[PDB]
Amino acid sequence: GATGSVGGGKGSGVGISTGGWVGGSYFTDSYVITKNTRQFLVKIQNDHKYRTENIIPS
Amino acid sequence: GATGSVGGGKGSGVGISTGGWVGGSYFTDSYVITKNTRQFLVKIQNDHKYRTENIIPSNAGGKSQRCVSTPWSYFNFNQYSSHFSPQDWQRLTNEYKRFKPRKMHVKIYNLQIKQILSNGADTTYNNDLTAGVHIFCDGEHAYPNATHPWDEDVMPELPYETWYLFQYGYIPVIHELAEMEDANAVEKAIALQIPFFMLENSDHEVLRTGESTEFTFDFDCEWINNERAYIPPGLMFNPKVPTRRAQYIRQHGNTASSNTRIQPYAKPTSWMTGPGLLSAQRVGPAGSDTASWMVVVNPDGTAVNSGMAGVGSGFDPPSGSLRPTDLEYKIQWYQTPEGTNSDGNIISNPPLSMLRDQALYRGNQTTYNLCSDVWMFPNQIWDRYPITRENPIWCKKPRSDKNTIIDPFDGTLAMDHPPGTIFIKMAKIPVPSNNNADSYLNIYCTGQVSCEIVWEVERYATKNWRPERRHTALGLGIGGEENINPTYHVDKNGKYIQPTTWDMCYPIKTNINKVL
Amino acid sequence: NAGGKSQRCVSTPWSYFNFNQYSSHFSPQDWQRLTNEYKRFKPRKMHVKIYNLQIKQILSNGADTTYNNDLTAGVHIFCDGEHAYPNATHPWDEDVMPELPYETWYLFQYGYIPVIHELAEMEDANAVEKAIALQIPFFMLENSDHEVLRTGESTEFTFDFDCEWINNERAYIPPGLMFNPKVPTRRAQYIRQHGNTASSNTRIQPYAKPTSWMTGPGLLSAQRVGPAGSDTASWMVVVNPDGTAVNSGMAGVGSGFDPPSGSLRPTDLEYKIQWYQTPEGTNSDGNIISNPPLSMLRDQALYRGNQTTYNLCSDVWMFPNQIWDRYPITRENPIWCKKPRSDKNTIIDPFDGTLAMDHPPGTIFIKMAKIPVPSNNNADSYLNIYCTGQVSCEIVWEVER
Amino acid sequence: GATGSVGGGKGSGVGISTGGWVGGSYFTDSYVITKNTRQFLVKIQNDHKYRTENIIPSNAGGKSQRCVSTPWSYFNFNQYSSHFSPQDWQRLTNEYKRFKPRKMHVKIYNLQIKQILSNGADTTYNNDLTAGVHIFCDGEHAYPNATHPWDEDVMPELPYETWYLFQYGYIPVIHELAEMEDANAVEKAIALQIPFFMLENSDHEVLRTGESTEFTFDFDCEWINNERAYIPPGLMFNPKVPTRRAQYIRQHGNTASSNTRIQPYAKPTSWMTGPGLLSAQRVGPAGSDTASWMVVVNPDGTAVNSGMAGVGSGFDPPSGSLRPTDLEYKIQWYQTPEGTNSDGNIISNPPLSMLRDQALYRGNQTTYNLCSDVWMFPNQIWDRYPITRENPIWCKKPRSDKNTIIDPFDGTLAMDHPPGTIFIKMAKIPVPSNNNADSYLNIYCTGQVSCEIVWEVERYATKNWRPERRHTALGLGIGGEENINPTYHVDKNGKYIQPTTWDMCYPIKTNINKVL
């Protein structure tokens, strides 16, 4: 941020973060920039397999 | 330290520390440096969500602020006891006639995020090495301010106490408007305009355990004056020198009209008493907001029937540089959060500076009567409130078009941009839930925070022949469990003994004389 | 059980290392070779390294106890080289660096005496005791900078001794015996007339030659007082600022001064330095009593002629032309002592044989990071952890054959 | 002064001043400078001749010193109140842990010799423009010393008081020898050896009214320590740490022999009580020389029947760093020359430093008994006598072959060469007399004397958390003719109010703590 300094090293590791939160918008005449960060969750889908099935209707 | 060598490598990692403990003060003629390190704890606030709720008041008739509560926590450095030991504060107020903060450096480092595992009654803790902590400084004051003077949970006075950050929150609305009685169009328009602030709307830094961050701030500040006046500005003249001025006395019933030369000891002054409001008196129960003078904003819609003790903020101390008539007009606080019922409270006293306890008296042509309200008037001269080590340092000065002289009556330095508040939050770590819900990993963060203030100081020189008042340990008291322990010491239970009087807190504008 | 004699201390969360003793730095082999082959030695430089650190969390599941590494936990390490704080160590203290290298060292808590407690007792209302109390200093080690180490970090310390020599040589004769018994002397003596012995003026005998060199100082007179539990020493060094009629049974008010004897021959076992070899030593089992080295500068006496016999005068104060030797030190003696800061002092020759210096090696203070855990109720609860590491001490000793 | 310009010419003359008034102090970190100017008066002493006479004693049995009195006068700068205001002394003892004198500069200037004309009851004064004044500094101490510590007529404490120099004189003999009872050969040999000193035996400078003189001196001094000990050296250890040491208790009648480990709170010390002599008691009437301990020199000839109270000098304070048992062992003085009968006297008190009031107790194997005489012994450690602003600064250390540690018990700095005394005398102006006689012109000299001391100082730094004792004006008293006037101030008659207690004089070794 303003006059901020991160003391994490340049080397990657388990205890080093790979980035930081970005957010907010910036308006000019010619362009607008939107910045958005989300925390996502990925879990196991479909029991690790491909299946071809008919969707049951109502 | 002296001839010390650390054998940790330059590369960052899980097993490398990101800094070391700093502590102590350093005194020079031009500046003083205070170094302070604390161990802090950050935990999950507000169940990871933003909420807007009314604060429930006490048994008193309901007076409620509506706040937005956030998942975020913040650091609050604003107080002198946090940056100065009682030793260092004594030396500051004895040896220097003025001081101000110059630059500030904050470092957050040696961070640990641990998962909280509940097996049962027993609780276990495991490092989450990949968990991040979100740290953000608002230097432009783009969000509402986190801190308010005289607030609790400020950086611990003693360096070995843990700091447990408070949840961040702000008041979006005037709640008497948010109540929305029946259908009122202006209250509807106030409500549709209520702002909402998420800290996620900006960029912040995410730190894992091997990372650290630093912050720097430059104060642009007016001086805090430590000198006292031994006479009023009305007394500076020579009583043996005659004056050219004449006075006229209107004829009373038993006293004839007369025109005479002013007495050499009676010489008139051009310098007015400072402003202050002595008139009003406190109202209502303790639970409700109660102050003699109530500052309100009513946009529309009300007949002001509300028992407006809660509608306004309340203004105290009202008195300024006037001598407080009652204890109600005095700044008083508690030394510890457990302070209650005039136990542990410290009441401010007159510094015995002649710019401080002031009055106007209005001649009714028989006697003199005290006129309570002294408004701002030309040629007024006064001194700022004498501040002890327990006072807050600064206040956020609100953005506005117009303002009068800025001299907060609690003694804080009011500025457009104070040091920006550092907001800290742990990463919000979801865990899968088969049922639809939001469940999160239960974690907490501990780290070290170091604050380094550079204070600009100036020594005094006097032509006074006689010795002057100084702060001494002999004005301190004894307390404890066995009642053998002096102030600012610890007892057999580890309890820190607290100053029981306002003098034990070593106020300014006591020791050092100035010639007007 | 003795009548209450109590010091008031400040106890700290900190621990310290104590290197002060010879058995810690010398094997019995190395000590033997030192004292056989060298006439003097002194410490020259000291190097300490703290490394291979492990912080482990202590987990109580139940009767069983498990240990897990905390990889991000730091340990706080601080050296006080300027002696800005009170000293951690005192000579002859226990829990010094283990004599044998394979024994674990378990650091003791640091603490200091802020007050004279007979003053801190504050009987009734006394103004001077009130003034003493308001002046009691308080020291936190957190008031300074210290280094924080995680498990992959290490630290090092260096110290240069400026020391006087420790002399290993003995005297085979007193300084009073150095002359030739067959050479006549020019000196004459006069004997006052006794009742049955006439006045006479005669030449001094060639074997009787007089000496210019005095017995060293020492205090033989006083005797120990009171029960074992109370502080008891023949000679009691006290400081009374004001306020007391000194009724206190001052055995506890003062520190007590022993050995008092200096280079005088101890009259009683009470005047001898004795210690125990192990912390389990009790009741004259495992105790070692110091003996005369059989050096002629060591067991000394004055006798005062009453013109019939000679009587031993117990107190020999400091006097010109006194000559003596320092207390003979074994491998179990402490090496140095902190010499207290003061305006004025006499000759510094501690009677226990330690080297007293303005700045000894600074004490290294060690503490684990204080790791809080959240508590829903308001309290202070901390993570239960401990640190193990390796500490290496390297002394360079200057010797002379 | 500030942007000031003197229009007096560079050439010296009757109408040109040889200097200007200097005053005030200047504080830095490394040094302090004191500047003092006084107006002095020199008049004719001893009728222009050297005389050797016995001093007449009081109603007490005759005890008499034989002195040589001289026509000369001298300046005496030795005291702190002369160079420091009460303000400056307070600041010195609060802000600095040690100080010593560094260099000294004296200037004698603006001299006026006036003839005293007696017409009758009226007395007139006329300038003698050609009259000289003789000024001499003895820097090598070739003559006997003029000054002795605690002497009166030292440079006035307040700068506006006139200084009236005292006649110089010295003791050539021990007078009990000079008495020469009957015929004694050794007393005859002592008498034939009595030295005689004229100041005229050396070179001195002669000044007329347009002349001035300057003197410089460099102190080589040990420090004066302002710090205090909060514990004895016997208490520095940890009461919870066990000790290896064992003790043996001899069997008493009802107490069996035992050999046990020393208690962790009982740990023995290697550090001895400082020396002092408590035994002796004062003797005889007040008029005679009376001290508990009497230092004499008897070369021969006497059976010492003389009531030797007068033969010796007397040694006090005898006590050193031992706690004084009686008031007889305490240093006490009077603030003014008019002080009498415990009115205006200040008695020294314990500084409450733990290196100061000390004792030995000797176990008799039942109780402890105080042994009065503590001689010099190895491993003794103590502090110097705490000095107030009224103490003399230095003492002349006598030339001798051998000496022990130099620690004068009054706190003065004893040195081989102190600042040399400046002797001043007017020219001896004869007038013709027809009858044979010696008649002289009656004249007196007034001038300005300025003394500038550079003091080397050092500030303190502490790790102590708590506030420390400081000297404050609130420890001062009120006095005067109307009893409304504080200490170190003047009353309506111009009388300067004096400290009535030893604390009001601000001793050292009180405020600043040191860790042993």
Query: DSSP letters along B423-483, please?
Result: EEEE---EE--SSS--EE--EEEEEEEEEEEEEEEEE------S------GGG--EESSSS
Scanning every residue of chain C, which has its alpha carbon at the shortest distance from the alpha carbon of D460? C84
- Chain A residues near residue B204 by CB distance under 8 angstroms: 1, 20-21, 23
Distances (CA, A) of D184 to D177, D189, D300: 10, 9, 9
Q: Return d(Cα B513, Cα D90) in angstroms, integer.
A: 14
Q: Residue B341 contacts by C-beta under 8 Å, 6 or more apart in sequence?
A: none
Q: What would the two tokens of residue D180 be?
A: 């020469």
Facing D87 at nearest CB: one of B29, B94, B464: B464
**Residues 6 or more apart whose Cβ sits within 8 Å of residue C223:** C234, C268, C270, D250, D363, D364, D365
Tell which of B5, B10, B17 to mutate to test the C interface (max C CBs under 10 Å): B17
Alpha-carbon gap, residue B484 to B495, rounded angstroms: 13
Report the alpha-carbon distance of residue B451 to residue B105 in Å, rounded: 6
According to DSSP, residue D395 is labeled E
Contact B108, B73 (CB under 8 A): no
**Looking at beta carbons, which residues of chain B come within 8 Å of C135?**
473-474, 486
Task: Find out whether D68 and D45 touch, Cβ atoms under 8 Å.
Answer: no
CA atoms within 13 A on the CB side of C308: 2
Q: Which helix (H) or strand (E) holds B192?
A: helix B185-192
The amino acid at residue B465 is W
Interface check for A15 against chain B (CB to CB < 8 A): the answer is yes
Say whether B39 and C133 touch across the interface (CB within 8 A): no
In order of B133, C41, C99, C108, the CA distances from C398 in angstroms are 54, 5, 21, 31
Q: Two tokens at B174? A: 């005037």
Asked if C372 lies within 8 A of B158 by C-beta distance, the reply is no
Distance CA(D124)–CA(D131), nearest Å, equals 17
How long a stretch of residues is chain C?
401
Identity at D178, one-letter amino acid code = A
Q: Which of C60, C71, C131 sits opposite B15 (nearest CB)?
A: C71
Q: Which of residues 386-445 of B touch C (CB under 8 A)?
A: 444
Q: Do A21 and B200 lie within an 8 Å CB cutoff?
A: yes
Q: Which chains touch B (3 or more CB pairs under 8 A)?
A: A, C, D
Question: A5-6 and B213-218 as β-strands: parallel, antiparallel, unpaired?
Answer: antiparallel
User: For residues D33 and D26, what is the distance between their CA atoms, to the nearest angstrom?
Assistant: 5
Task: Name the residue among C274, C246, C112 with its Cα closest to residue C236.
Answer: C246
Is the peptide bond between B317 and the residue preceding it cis, with omega within 30 degrees of 0?
A: yes
Full DSSP string of D314-368: -B-S--TTBPPSSGGGS-EEESSTT-BTTBSEEE------TTTSEEEEEEBSSSE
- For D419, the enclosing helix (H) or strand (E) is none
Residue of B nearest to C66 (CA): B124
Q: Give the C-alpha separation, B477 to B486, whole Å.
A: 6
Closest residue by Cα to residue D344 from D328, D327, D332, D331: D332
Residue of B nearest to D84 (CA): B465
CA distance D137 to D106: 11
Task: Inspect the interface and report whether the beta carbons of B200 and A23 lie closer than 8 Å.
Answer: yes
- In the DSSP assignment, the letter for residue B328 is G
Number of H helices and number of E strands within chain B? 4, 31
Using an 8 Å Cβ cutoff, are B422 and B137 in contact? yes
Contacts of B499 (CB under 8 A, 6+ apart): B335, B346, B476, B477, B487, B488, B505
> Does the beta-carbon distance from B472 to D476 stay under 8 Å?
no
Q: How is residue A44 written in tokens?
A: 């196991």
Q: Please report residues of D whose CB lies closer than 8 A to that of B462.
A: 87
**CB distance C15 to D247 below 8 Å:** no
Residues of B in contact with C150 (CB under 8 A): 8, 14-17
The helix (run of H) or strand (run of E) holding residue B392 is none
Distance CA C366, CA C107 (A): 9
Cα-Cα-Cα-Cα torsion B45, B48, B53, B59, nearest 10 degrees, comes to -30
**Residue B403 buriedness (CB in 10 A; 0-12 / 13-18 / 19+):** exposed
With beta carbons less than 8 A apart as the criterion, state whether C332 and C23 touch.
Answer: yes
How many helices, marked H, and strands, marked E, lie in chain C?
4, 24
Nearest to D471 among B29, B467, B487 (CB): B467
Nearest CA in chain A to B14: A15
Residue A23 in tokens: 């957010």
What is the spatial distance between Cα C362 and Cα C17, in angstroms, rounded to a whole number? 10
Which residues are CB-neighbours of B250 under 8 A, at least 6 positions away? B257, B365
Q: Name the residue among A4, A16, A39 with its Cβ closest to that of B12.
A: A16
- Flag whether residue B201 sits within 8 Å of chain A, measured between CB atoms: yes
The answer to whether the CB of D392 falls within 8 A of the CB of D78 is yes
CB-CB neighbors (< 8 A) of B37 in chain C: 142
Q: Check C148 against B20: CB less than 8 A apart.
A: yes
Rg, Å, chain A Cα set: 21
| Residue B83 burial class via C-beta count within 10 angstroms: exposed 0-12, middle 13-18, buried 19 and up | buried
List of chain B residues whose C-beta atoms are within 8 Å of the C-beta of residue C370: 39, 160, 162
C347 touches chain D (CB under 8 A): yes
Classify burial at C378, counting beta carbons within 10 Å of its beta carbon; exposed 0-12, middle 13-18, buried 19 or more: exposed
Q: By three-state DSSP, how is residue C131 classified?
A: helix
Q: Which residues pair with B259 in a beta bridge?
A: B248
Structure tokens at C306: 């009453």
Strands D66-74 vs D96-118: parallel, antiparallel or unpaired: unpaired
Technique employed here was cryo-EM
Q: Does chain A touch chain D (at least 3 C-beta pairs within 8 Å)?
A: no
Q: How many CB pairs under 8 A join C and D?
A: 316
For B370, B372, B378, C298, the CA distances from B270, given in Å and listed in that order, are: 19, 20, 10, 87
Question: Is B493 within 8 Å of chain C by CB?
Answer: no
Find chain B residues with C-beta within 8 A of C76's C-beta.
21
φ, ψ for residue C258, nearest 5 deg: -150, 145
Query: CB-CB: which of B203, B217, B428 is closest to A39?
Result: B428
Chain C CB within 8 Å of residue B204 CB: no
Q: How far is CA B476 from each of CA B479, B498, C122, C243, D512, rounded to the nearest angstrom?
A: 10, 10, 16, 20, 16
Backbone angles phi, psi at B123, to 5 degrees: -125, 130
Specify the pairing of strand C336-338 against strand C355-357: parallel
What does the alpha-carbon distance between residue D265 and residue B73 come to, in Å, rounded to a whole number?
A: 48
D101 touches chain B (CB under 8 A): no
Is residue C398 classed as helix, strand or coil in its secondary structure? strand
SS3 C290: coil
User: How far does the CA of residue B475 sit from the closest CA of chain C (Å)?
Assistant: 8
Integer Cα distance of D454 and D102 in angstroms:
5
Dist. CA B446–CA C373, nearest whole Å: 8
- Residues found in chain D: 516
Residue pair D332/D306 in contact by the 8 Å Cβ criterion: no
Strand runs labelled E in C3-113: 10-16, 40-60, 65-69, 75-80, 109-112
Q: CA-CA distance, B382 to C141, in Å (whole number)?
A: 43
